[PDB]
Every structure is written in C-alpha cells, then in structure tokens.
Amino acid sequence: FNKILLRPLLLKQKNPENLRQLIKKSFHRTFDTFESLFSMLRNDEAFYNRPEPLRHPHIFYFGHTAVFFINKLILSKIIDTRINAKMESIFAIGVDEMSWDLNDDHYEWPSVEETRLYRNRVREVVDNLINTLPLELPITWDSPWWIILMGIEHERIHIETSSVLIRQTDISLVLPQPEWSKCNVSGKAPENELLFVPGGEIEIGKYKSDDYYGWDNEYGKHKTVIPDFKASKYLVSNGEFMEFVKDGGYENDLWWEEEGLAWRNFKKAKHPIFWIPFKNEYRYRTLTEIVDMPLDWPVDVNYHEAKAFCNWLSAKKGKPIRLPVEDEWYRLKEYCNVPDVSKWDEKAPANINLEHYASACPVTQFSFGNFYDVIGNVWQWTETPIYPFNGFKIHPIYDDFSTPTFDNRHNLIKGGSFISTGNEILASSRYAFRRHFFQHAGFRYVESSYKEKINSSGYESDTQVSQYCEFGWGDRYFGIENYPKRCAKICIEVTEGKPRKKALDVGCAIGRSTLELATSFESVTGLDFSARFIEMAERMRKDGSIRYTITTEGELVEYKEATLPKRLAKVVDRVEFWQADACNLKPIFTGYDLVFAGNLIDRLYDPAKFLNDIGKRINSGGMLILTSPYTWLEEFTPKQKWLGGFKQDGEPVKSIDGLKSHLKDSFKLIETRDIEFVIRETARKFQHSVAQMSIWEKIL
Amino acid sequence: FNKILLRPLLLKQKNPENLRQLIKKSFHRTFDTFESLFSMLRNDEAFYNRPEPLRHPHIFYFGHTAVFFINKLILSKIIDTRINAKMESIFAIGVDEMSWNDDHYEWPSVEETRLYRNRVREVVDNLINTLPLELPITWDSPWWIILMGIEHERIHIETSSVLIRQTDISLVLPQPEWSKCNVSGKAPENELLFVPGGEIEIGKYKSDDYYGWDNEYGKHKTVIPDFKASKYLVSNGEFMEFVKDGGYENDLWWEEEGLAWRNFKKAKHPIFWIPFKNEYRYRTLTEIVDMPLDWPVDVNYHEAKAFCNWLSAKKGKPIRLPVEDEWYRLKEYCNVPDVSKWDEKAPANINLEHYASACPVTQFSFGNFYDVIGNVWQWTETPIYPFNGFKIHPIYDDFSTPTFDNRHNLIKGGSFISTGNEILASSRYAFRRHFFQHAGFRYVESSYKEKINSSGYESDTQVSQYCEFGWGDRYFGIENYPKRCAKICIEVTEGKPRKKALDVGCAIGRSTLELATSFESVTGLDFSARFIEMAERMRKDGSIRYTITTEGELVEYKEATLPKRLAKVVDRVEFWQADACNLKPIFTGYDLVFAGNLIDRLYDPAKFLNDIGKRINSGGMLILTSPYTWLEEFTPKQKWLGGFKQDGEPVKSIDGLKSHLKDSFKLIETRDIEFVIRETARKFQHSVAQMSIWEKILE
C-alpha cells in the first residue's frame, strides 16, 4: 500500500467517484514521494549544489514539479489565479540541449523554505480541484483530469531523474534515509549467454481511446518484421563489464563510435560514472552510500559505453553483437510473456516502481521466461532514436513534450529501473535520452542481422517548404478543394480515350499532382527548380509520409504529418522526381502524352522558350495543360518576355491571347477553366487566387 | 446635298434594316470624305511632309483611320483575319504628349496605303451586310465598334484638315469640293451681353440615342451665377488691336505656361496669319488670301488667354475664357437646336454643310449671340475630366483617360469641318493648351471661380490596393472590411457617449467617415502621408480615382464617389499623418479608439497600447482588429504581443493583449472578421482578422 499507489491508474473505472479518490490518493502519494526524495540531501545548503553540469541545481527541480501544475492549469484555463508568478517563471523550464559542452550560475534561487511553503500551497489547490471539479467518464484529452494526471506523471519522471542527480551528488552532501534503502544482497557475477529469441510481426502504438494516461509519443501505429535473433540472458553486470574495463576498454579507441569517442575524450572517462576508484579496485555508489562492488548487479552506463562494450565483445566472440532496437525489446518482452501492470499482484514481479529496493539488485533475481530483467532493475539502452509513430498528435497543453526530442539524438531506453514509477512502468511508454546522459540505465546486448531503417528526423520548418507541403498535402481552406489534386483530376478527365504512356509534371513542388497523375498514366515525371521541393517530393514517394510545421502565430507552429493514402502508395513505382530548370530541360525528358505545368509560366524567366521547347517533347495529339494566375512581375520575368499584361499597337494583350500567339503553329486550345486555390501563410493569413487552366492539344 | 449623311446617326430607328443601310451609307460617305481630303495634297510626295512637329506626316493618318477599323475588329473578336499586320502596326497609334516619336524613316508608299484602305472598305462593307442587327444597339453590340471606327475617322477628317492648313502652300492644291467662303467685310465691334446663371446638368445616360465616347457619359451638376459673354467670336480685326498693341511683346498678359510656349515658338502672330510687308494675310486650307477681318481668329488657349488678360486691363473688368458649364448655359439660353431638329441645312457653319473654312462672325445668329455653335471651336478654361459614372469601353479603354491630366482644355461648339459625333451637344473634345485647331474663342465676364480636382488616376501599388480595399467592390462575397468594422464599433457603443472618436491606421479613411455617422467628431490618423492625402481628397472633393492591376501593366480605371449619407458627415472628420507609437498629446479624450489591422504592423505595439490608454475617456471603448501576422519586418521579436513561447508555454496574441491591457481595460468580446485585399484580377489576400473589443475601467 505504501508504494502500490505509485502504479499508473486504470482510468476506466466503474464509478467516477471511486476514480476521484484514486486520483486524490495518487496525487498526494506522488507529491509525498518527491518531497521525501530530497530528505536524502544532508541540509538545505545542498539543494543549491549542481551535481550534473548539464542540469540545474536540486532546488530548481524541487519547485519545478509543483510549478508545472500551476503553469499547466493556468494555460488550460482550469484555474485563473497564480500562486507566485515570480517563482512560476524561475521554476518553469528545465534544460535539455546538452551537447556535453553549460550554464554558469547567474540564477537567484529562492530559499529552500520558500519553496517548501510554495509546494504546500500547490498541494491544496490541486486537492481542492480534485474535490470540486466534475468527473465525466471516460477521461479524454480535453478533460481537466488529463492535466492533473499530466502533472502527476511529470512529477514521477522527476522522481527518477532527480534520484540520479542525488546519486551524482558528493557523498558528503547526502544523507541515507531508511525510506530509500538499498538492496543488501550481492554475490558472484553469473556467466552471461545469448539465448534464442524468435522474430515476427511487431505491432506497437497506442490508440487514442486506450485506458491509461499516456504522453503524445506513445500514440500511433508502427509495424515491422524482425528476424530470429539472440539476446543476452541477463543484463550486463558490473562483473561482466569489469572484464571490458580491465581489457583497456576505455583505453582502446577501436571500440568507440565517432560520437562516443568524442564524448569519452572530452570527459576523460576511464570508468563508469558510479564506479569509485579505490586503490587498485573499484567501489560502487548507490543513491547515498558507497559500498563494495556488487558484481552481479547491472552496470550503469550511457549509450556510448554500452556500445563500446558491444564492439569490444564482438571482437572476442567473433560475432556481430550490438544493442537492441526498440522493436527487438518489444519482441523479447512478448516472447517472455512479461505481464502488464494491470495483472500484477501485491508485489511487482520486477525491481521496479520502488516496490522492492531503492537501488539495483542482482541480475539473477527477477526472471521472465528464459530471460532476466526484461523489465525493472535498470533501463536498457537501445539503438533506436525516439521518433513519432504514424498518427502522432501533440497535446495542446504540452505541445513540445516530445517533439524537440525527435532529432535522432535521443536514444530510446526500455524496461524501467527500480525507481521508475507510474507511466514509466507501462509497456507503451517511451523514454529517451542523449547518448551521453547518465541514468539508472544499463544494457542487454543482442546478436541480430536486422538492419533498422531510420528516417529523417524532426519536422521540416522552412517557411517555403512548409507552405507547399500544406498546399499539396494539407487541409482545405475556405472550402476550396486541393489544387494539385483537382488539376491532376482534370488532366485525367481531358485525356479519356487518349494515350497515357508518359506524363510530365513541371513545377511539381511536393508532388501531389505527380502522384495523382500516376494513377492513370503509366510513367509520370515530376520536375521542379527547387532541390528542396524535390527532396520532400521524393521522401513522400519513398517513405510514404512527410512531417512539417505550419505557422499559427509568429513562431508558434502546428505539427503536421501527411501520410500517403493507399491509392497513391500503389503507383509510387511509376513516379520519378528530379530537379530541373523548365527553361533548359535535359533532352532525355521527351515523348510525353501529357505535360502539366501548374502555376509556373508566370514564374519562368523565359516562358516563351519553355513553350517552344516543351512542344518538341509532346507526342502528336498530346495534351499541354497550363495553369497560372498571370502574376507577371519583373522579379521572375523581364517585361519583354511576358506573355500578357502589356499593351502593343495600342491594344491590350491578355495572357490567354499571348498563349494562343506562341502556340499558334503547333497547338490548339481545347478549353479554359477557372480554378481557385488557397495557400496558407499563418492561421489567419492566406493567399486566395483564381488561376486559369488552359488545355491545349498537339497538332498532328 | 449628300452632306446630311455626315450627321450623327440616330440609333433608335423604327426598323433594324433601315439602320443597316444608314450605317452602310454613313461608312462609305465618311470613308469617301476622308480620302477626298488628301486630294488637297499637291502630289504623293506631300504625304510625307510633317506640317506639325508634334504630329506624324500625312501618310500616317491616311492609313491610320483604316487600320483603326481592323485593330478594333480584331480586338473585339468580330473578325479573325488581318489584312496586313505589318501596316496595321505602322499606322496603329498616333501621338499625343505634344508638349511644345517616329522620325524621318521609311513609310509605306501612298499607293500601297490606297490599296489597303480599299481592302478595309470591303471588309467593313461585308460586315455591315452580314452581321445581325439587334435593337437597341448596346456597347456590347458589334455595330458599336463599326460606329466607333466611323466616328474616329471623322475626328481625323478635322484634325488632318488642320495639318493640311499648316502645310507649306506649295504642297497643297485647292479643290472645288473644299471651297472656302468668299465673303468678308469689316469687323463688327464686339460687346458683352447678359447670360443668366442657374442649374447646370450635363452628362449622357447609358441608354441615350447617339453613339458617344466614354467621356460623354455620367452626371455633372453645378450652379453658376449671372455673367456676360461676348456677342460674337473674337474676329481677326478684334484680335488685331491686341497684336498691334504688342500683345506678343508684352509678358504681363501671358500665364506661366503660355509665356514659356510663346518664347519657345518665338510667336509674334497667330498661326494662320502670313506676315506680308507691314500687313497680315490669311491662310485657309489651301489658299493665302487677304485678311477677312470679320472672320474669327485662329488661336490656341495661350493666345486666347493673353488676349483676355490684355482686354481685362483695358476695360478695367475681369475678362476670361468661359468654363464648359458656362458655354452649355449660353447654349440653353440662346435655344440652340440639337442636330435631330435641323432642317435640310444646318443652322450654323458646321458639318461641312456650308464652307471648308470659317465665315464672317455676323452670319449665323443664335438668339442675341452669334456662332454659339459652328464656325470655329471655342476655347474654355476647363481641363477635360470624367463625369461621375464615367466608364471606359473595353475596346478603347484609353481613348480619353490619358487626357485627364489637367493639361487638355475643353473646346466647344465645333467648326466648319466638325462632323458626326463632334456636332452633338454631349460630345466633349479637348486639346493641350498650346495646340492649334480651327479654334477661336469667345470671352466672358464672370466672378464664378470653377473648382478643379486632382487630375489622373492614382497608380502607386499600395495606394491603389487600399483605395480598392476601402472603396472598391466585394471579392469572394466578403463584405467591405473598413465599413463592417466601423458598423460594429457603432454596435458595441450603443447607450454610450459618442462625442469624439479616433481611427488609427485609417488608410483611405472608409472607416473614419463611416464612424462619423454616429460620432460627432472623428479623427483619422495614418503613418502614410500618401494615404492621408487620398483620405483628405475623398473628404473635400467627394471623389477619388485610382487604377487597379488586372494583368501585368494593364489596369482597371475605378472611380470612388462619396455616398450621400457620408457626404453629410464630412465636416466632422479630420485626417492627419501620425505615428501611432508616438502620438501628439493633442489627440486625446476619445469615447472610442479604433485601430484596424495595425498592431502587428507597429514597431512597438506595447508602447502604443500604453499611450492610447491615457487618451480614452472613462468607460470608453478600445477596439482592435488584427490577423496577428507578426514579422520582424515590422516588429522586433522582443516586442511581439503573441506568437512566441515564454516560461515554456505558448503566448497567443489575444492572451498577450489581455496581459498588456490588464491594468486599464476589460475584454468584452472577440469576433472573426474576414477581409480580402486585391493584388491583381486573379490574386488576392484572404485573411481572418480577430476583433477584440475592450472597455476602460471606470475608475
């Protein structure tokens, strides 16, 4: 009962008032646990120590978890009065961004007693909210209870991450507390071995209507197939890692990847971060105690050290050994039939959720099938940088919880440690760290031929690429249907009963019309002057999805993911994208039954030359289709080379009349059509234009 | 005889096929007359003489009136086949801009041009026979283009006869078809006769009978007082006193424009006076004869104006040239009959129905006056201008708009050779003040000071867009934005004081004038001096004119006239240039301050919200609209009100407004308001502004 309340709450309870008391007790117990964590600091002066250079002092996180409640309840408009706006700014945002290179004090921290009194006032506000706020089932993302739970599961994250910081604090500044006792059993390190793990269909990703609270990075759908592989029986113990250290592992550059080698030489690292050099031997550092080395406990390493061990072990065993991917750990868990939190008894079946120890335990204590410590004890590093599943959607109250970590620099860790609580002990939760950062994290190694495919990280934010991604793959504005798609549908319309072997899409941009044309034309080529546009158009064709940000106001953005629909995914093999200047096309681009050029002719420096060159490249009786708003400007075209918008012989020359004039000898005008299109700039500013489509047929 | 066919055709005929034959005869007769004019050139070589340095040689206008038909029939898609595109470009456009192009280069041969005109004649003759005729004739009818080509040629019949009259006497040949008047005597003494004032109302309705150019349509009303006009036109003999008194030698009589022209041409005598020993001889179209002292004199405006200034000094009275309204008043007072009421012979020396020259000023009487119409054109002091309701014809959109430059003064009455549309009362012709025509002048005595507005059309891209934004049409069905915002301001101020209001970022002031309908005093402020000038111009003059882009350099001529309900509240409005971030302290004590689409265009919007609060009365309303397009082009990121993250949470713009306006204002409501800004005929900005309505704390 003392630590069982730290398990994540099942939210689909039969009674709403029974769920109220569970959330009330889940909040106070989490608040109590975090405040009890700092009782391991010797005195109030130790709150202002910075144990990890890449993080704040303890005092910041002491108030940060309470301030986080107020800032989210104010932003969600659940409450309207702040408790202390001064403190709520100073404890606002933590620090990531640690390239292992640095804040220099210059912070005026409140006193420890000041922060204690503030935290107590946050507790009554939330307690009053839990008492007075209506509870409507089921709990949705819009429900105010989601924000309260967000503060709870965020505080539980800081329970673990501050315990690492305490474990990194000078031993003279910490005080052992019986509420945070260590494991007292340790012995000989067992001999690890590689055991068989079967492959199969991996299917992870949380649906929107699943039961527990979850962060945004948990939701989506991800499927892949991994082969049969081998995983180590135990986590890598201190003793197993001791062989690597005694074989000059930190001295031999052959084992260290280029990033880890750079980190190792900067830190001048010679041994794991919680190994204390003692004469010719090594001692071990728990949260608040220095004890003799427990050789059968797991080792604590960042990614670089664990990877260096795997490269060293590969040379000894003569076999390719590496860290697992996230999918391989999920396969291992399912193969071992690890039970979810909802099926646990009075005690957790792993060293987890603070239900057994406030430190690691022997790697031989908790078994799961043929394996040990599949969950619990310490985190297990992976080689998969955290990434959003297909269907990922941010929560509006914390839109940047995970999206800044989608940078191919935060490697996923699985299993959870002895102190991982709440959301962290769910199977669907996904936590990641910079590959140099230290936690209660070790590693299990695998032997696998599986080569995981990593995609481009982050979201594209170049304003020009963002707009045209939205223009071809975004939503409809003012009820105007998709312009690249509508144009392509008209191309398919006016070519019924006509040849459809080859088609060319000049000015294809992000290639929506190109893929739409490929549904009826056997070979379609997309050309655009922008190498950036072609890169995104090819990425959508290969990967089947693109990610980008569109502006709402100023620097604020919305995160968008455009996924290729099933009907367009079939025809990706009929599409090619190339960078090309429409006024000097390579001779290889010829023999087309249809050439489409959308919003292009009024953007070319010599549109007459393009019309003269593209005619020689269309088959007899082929179709040339042009759309343009006729925005003639000296920015793109010299006035002498405009097709319209000027007076000659005292009569106005309209652009459509100039098009007949340049296409008189070789083309015939079928029809003209007016087509609206909308290009989004911000959430409130758009371009709304009426382009003219002109449909031409080649003279036989 | 057959000269009646040159009268303008009444288009509301009983039968459509009777109008066809009238137009058929009107075309051939006009085509015949223009070609008969150049028989007064002695040989083909004279076609390449340039009599007037500000115009082309005769050969150009010889083929121009035929090329005009083809170019208009091609542009209006009435025909699709050109006769000679090479010549249709050489004879395409004449030249104006003749302030005191195509030099001495190779023109087509005279025989080449003859054969071309003949092929043009059968194309038009074919069209007149085969085109369907639907009554009534409209601007969209193909018969309007044919009438346009006919009436354009009649203009060149008169203007080319001037050029012939300016041609060296050795290169012209008198023709019996163009005989002069042979009667002349002593000049009578002119006198000023009474002309009554009253209500002047001119302007052609769209559904009126005759063919007319664009500058004839619209409505113009004014009131002029009683005045006096000279009984006769100024004769050579009357003008001779001015010339013998050193008129061309005395600078006191010449206005600045005319003095500069006279020194440039070294003018010592009228243009058609030939100095012979100590006397002067006279030049008709093709003959040099003794001075007909009782014929009217041929002068430009500068010479006519200098005569009036000289006569003002002699008589001790303010004598000037009439304004166009005054000539129309003299015409109505003398009961001059319209062309539709004429008998077999015109009641004036006009329409080539009497002479190919001027005649004595004592010949044609109209009431107590002579030559109210006919004989020679009569100069005015009115630069030509479009009436309210002026609309161009798409086939010839620049026929008159380039003359709306305050430099082309109107001339009225017509001359002996004015034909067709020129002899209608509603027709309006104008020339640059230095230009020479068969034009004389009557003088007047009047204290009436005519008001002249700003000429031309505004073409600066920004001023055009915001003129269209405040005073143009609706696009995508979106209601006028400055007007809608002002109406909402009135809405949310019901039961509140309405003494003084301020419109910051007023642009062309549509919202400012709209606010004046319920606010006793409205002040409009804007950073752009160009905008404030146009806003004040709309307030004083009641109308503004600007061009909006269709494609490239092509434009659309727009006229925004102040509506009747806003003209009443004009006296309550002030327009001043001002920087909203550093306002002068005199702008204060407002019951409403409205700022449309401004805060995200200011360098320091927070400072503006702090300054403007001090200047609103207790319980007054502050209303802001903005799309929140925050950009470092206008505002440093540090001074944004929204669109940024702080303390790890997003700050939306409306929440930043509440934060800055917390101490002094209360948010009443917010509304989304769409607006459209036109860039071209096909490109627009379509945005959704948020209107935030704030009320100041009572204490």
Ligand SMILES: N[C@@H](Cc1c[nH]c[nH+]1)C(=O)O
């Ligand atoms: N991206 C942040 C999310 C976070 C905020 N607080 C705790 N965790 C991180 O990895 O640390």
Ligand SMILES: N[C@@H](Cc1c[nH]c[nH+]1)C(=O)O
């Ligand atoms: N604005 C021109 C109109 C015109 C063309 N041709 C004859 N007239 C002019 O006054 O001369």
Ligand SMILES: [Co+2]
């Ligand atoms: Co945090």
Ligand SMILES: [Co+2]
């Ligand atoms: Co002309």
